[PDB]
PDB file of C-alpha atoms in Angstrom:
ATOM      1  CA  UNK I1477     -11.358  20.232  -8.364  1.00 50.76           C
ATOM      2  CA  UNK I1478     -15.016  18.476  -7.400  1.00 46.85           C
ATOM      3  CA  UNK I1479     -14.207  15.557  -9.921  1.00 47.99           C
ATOM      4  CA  UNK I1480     -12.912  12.222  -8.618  1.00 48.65           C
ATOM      5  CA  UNK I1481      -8.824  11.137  -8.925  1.00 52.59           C
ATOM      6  CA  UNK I1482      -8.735   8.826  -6.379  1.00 50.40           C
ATOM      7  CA  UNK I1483      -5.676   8.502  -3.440  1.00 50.96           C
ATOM      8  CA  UNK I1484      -2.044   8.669  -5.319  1.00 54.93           C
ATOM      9  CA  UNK I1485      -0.922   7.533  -1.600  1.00 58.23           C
ATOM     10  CA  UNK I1486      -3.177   4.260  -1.719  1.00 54.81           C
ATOM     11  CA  UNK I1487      -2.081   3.278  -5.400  1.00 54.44           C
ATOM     12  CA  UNK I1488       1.799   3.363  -3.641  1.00 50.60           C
ATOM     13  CA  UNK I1489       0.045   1.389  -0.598  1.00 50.32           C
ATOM     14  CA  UNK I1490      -1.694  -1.148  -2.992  1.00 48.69           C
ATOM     15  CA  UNK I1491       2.033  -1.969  -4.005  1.00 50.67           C
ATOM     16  CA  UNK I1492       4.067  -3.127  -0.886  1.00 53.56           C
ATOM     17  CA  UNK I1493       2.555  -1.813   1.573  1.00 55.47           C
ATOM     18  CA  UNK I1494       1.924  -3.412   5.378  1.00 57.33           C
ATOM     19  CA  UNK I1495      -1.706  -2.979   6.111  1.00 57.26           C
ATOM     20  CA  UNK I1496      -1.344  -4.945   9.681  1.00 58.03           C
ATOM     21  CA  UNK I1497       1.553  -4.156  12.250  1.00 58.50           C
ATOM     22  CA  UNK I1498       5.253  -3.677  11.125  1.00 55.39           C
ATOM     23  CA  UNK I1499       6.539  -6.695  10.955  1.00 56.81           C
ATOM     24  CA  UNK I1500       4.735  -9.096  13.548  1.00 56.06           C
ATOM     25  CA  UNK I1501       0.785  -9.357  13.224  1.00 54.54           C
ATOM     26  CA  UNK I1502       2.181  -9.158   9.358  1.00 53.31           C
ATOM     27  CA  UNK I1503       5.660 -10.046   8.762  1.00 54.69           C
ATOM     28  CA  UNK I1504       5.957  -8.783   5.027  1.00 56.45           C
ATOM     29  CA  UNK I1505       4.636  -6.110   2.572  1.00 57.62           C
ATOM     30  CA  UNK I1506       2.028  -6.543   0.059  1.00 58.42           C
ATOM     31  CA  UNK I1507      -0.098  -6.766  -2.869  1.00 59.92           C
ATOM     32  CA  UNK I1508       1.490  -6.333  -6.416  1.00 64.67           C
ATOM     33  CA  UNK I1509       4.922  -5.880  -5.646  1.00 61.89           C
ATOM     34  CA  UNK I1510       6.392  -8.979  -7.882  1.00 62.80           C
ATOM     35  CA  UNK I1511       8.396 -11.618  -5.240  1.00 63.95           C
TER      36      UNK I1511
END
């Protein structure tokens, strides 16, 4: 339970996620989602 696994729910925001505001001070998702 102590160990590390990192955040499952950053790995799925990693993939297309909009860090900035939805969809104006960022207008599309991001990073390794292929385009």
């Amino acid at each position: 339970d102590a160990g590390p696994r990192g955040e499952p729910p950053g790995e799925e925001g990693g993939r297309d996620g909009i860090g900035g505001a939805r969809a104006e001070t960022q207008n599309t998702g991001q990073l390794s989602a292929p385009g």
